[PDB]
Structure 1
């Protein structure tokens, strides 16, 4: 069995290997990359996402989100308070202000220490979930707006034609902006490209051990667990590495820098934070190996998780027994 300790693997494809996306995902899995839940892909030196980032300041962040925490430093939730619209140039200036900028630090480890010590005492503003793409249309390799769609994959594997679309999302971050512990919708893969700016630190639980994280989360968030049998789908709960280690939960960590891709694998729980002003692009995707995970994915039906249009068909075809309850949660 490849990668039996479930370590995060880092890949350096050549320009030739970078042509066929599906083939390279399958290669990484042949080497055991999925056992970690997360892999890093460093593009060949010949490749670029676009020519420059000099002209992005007029993109609008219609609904910036202020991430307000409650709890203790290592075990907290966050809620998202909506703020007035602002452009990417305005948000960049805000991120760089004395109130929000990255503090002086020695290295990524010192900054990680400062994040976990101090996150709860601040409320950073995240420009998340913005439909769009920063890949040039002429970038042919690993262009996250040109991937095979999940609807087409389901149709190829299972024969059923379904409605829905699959487009990328932009994320504009600042120091301390936070992504809570989650798996993807329907336990899909994700791919994330850090286009520019400061790093993103990731934490991940191997898919084979995801239920250990869920059991800890039910202990640590007992009111939320009574409210919903899949409350991590709400994407609000944070647990620090120190608390994970105290409770014996297997996990790994890695820092993504600008110019790098990360892939999350089906049922790989992940969480993390941004180091300073940055911009990422991410999208969900599927492979044949996903189908079995999609069929078994948990679902939130309490009303909180509320998701895209395209998840309807995935539930309806892969999980017909759960469909009626889940759809009630959507309405």
Structure 2
């Protein structure tokens, strides 16, 4: 069995190996990369996502989200308070202000310590989940706006044609902006490219151990657990590495820098934070190996998780018994 300790693997494809996306994912899996839940892909030196980032300031963040925390430093939830619209140039200036900027630090480890110690005492503003792309149309390799669609994969594997579309999302971050512990909708893969700016730190639980994380979360968030049998689908709970270590939960950590891709694998729980002003692009995708995860994915039916149009068909075809209850949650 490849990668039996479920370590995060880093890949350096050549420009020739960067042509065929599906084939490279399958290669990474042949080496055990999925066992970690997360992999890093450093593009060949010849590749670029676009020519420059000099002209992005007029993109609109229609609903910036202020991430307000409740709890204790290592075990907290966050809610998102909607703020007034602002441009990317206005958001960059805000991120760089004295109130929000990254503090002085020695190295990534010192910054990580400061994040865990102090996150809860601040409410950073995240420009998350903005439909769009920063890949140039002429970039042919690993262009997240030109991937094979999940609907087409379901049709190729299962023979059923379904409605829905699959497009990328932009994330504009600042110091302390946070992504809570989650797997993807329908336990899909995700791919994330850090276009510019400061790093993003990730934490991940191997898929084979995801239920250990769920059991800890039910213990640590006991009211949430009673409200919903899949409350981590709400994407609001944070648990620190120190707390995970104290409770024996297997995980790994890695920092992504500008110009690097991350792939999350089906049922790989992940969480993390931004080091300073940055912009990432991400999209979900599927492979043949996903189908079995999609059929077994948990679902939130309490009404909180509220998701895209295109998840309807995935539930309806892969999980027909759950469909009725899940759709009640959506309505």
TM-score, length of structure 1 as denominator length: 1.00
Quote how far apart the aligned CAs of 1:142 are: 0.1
Quote how far apart the aligned CAs of 1:329 are: 0.1
Quote how far apart the aligned CAs of 1:55 are: 0.1
CA deviation profile, 1:31-82 (whole Å, cap 9, x unmatched): 0000000000000000000000000000000000000000000000000000
Quote how far apart the aligned CAs of 1:294 are: 0.0
CA distance in 1, matches of 2:139, 2:116: 38
CA distance in 2, matches of 1:77, 1:86: 26
CA deviation profile, 1:96-155 (whole Å, cap 9, x unmatched): 000000000000000000000000000000000000000000000000000000000000
CA deviation profile, 1:184-232 (whole Å, cap 9, x unmatched): 0000000000000000000000000000000000000000000000000
CA distance in 2, matches of 1:222, 1:243: 16
Match of 2:54, SS state, is coil
Q: RMSD across aligned C-alpha pairs, in angstroms?
A: 0.1
CA distance in 2, matches of 1:232, 1:245: 19
Quote how far apart the aligned CAs of 1:307 are: 0.1
CA deviation profile, 1:225-244 (whole Å, cap 9, x unmatched): 00000000000000000000
Quote how far apart the aligned CAs of 1:5 are: 0.1
CA distance in 1, matches of 2:81, 2:117: 22
Structure 1 gaps of 5+ residues are none
Quote how far apart the aligned CAs of 1:87 are: 0.1
Match of 1:25, SS state, is helix
CA distance in 2, matches of 1:48, 1:63: 29
* Displaced runs of 4 or more, over 6 A: none
CA deviation profile, 1:161-184 (whole Å, cap 9, x unmatched): 000000000000000000000000
Match of 1:195, SS state, is strand
Match of 1:179, SS state, is strand
Structure 2 gaps of 5+ residues are none
CA distance in 2, matches of 1:261, 1:289: 21
Match of 2:27 in 1: 27
Match of 1:244, SS state, is helix
CA distance in 1, matches of 2:306, 2:112: 31
Match of 1:81, SS state, is strand
CA distance in 2, matches of 1:113, 1:278: 20
CA distance in 2, matches of 1:55, 1:246: 46
CA distance in 2, matches of 1:212, 1:88: 39
Match of 2:329 in 1: 329
Match of 2:61 in 1: 61
TM-score, length of structure 2 as denominator length: 1.00
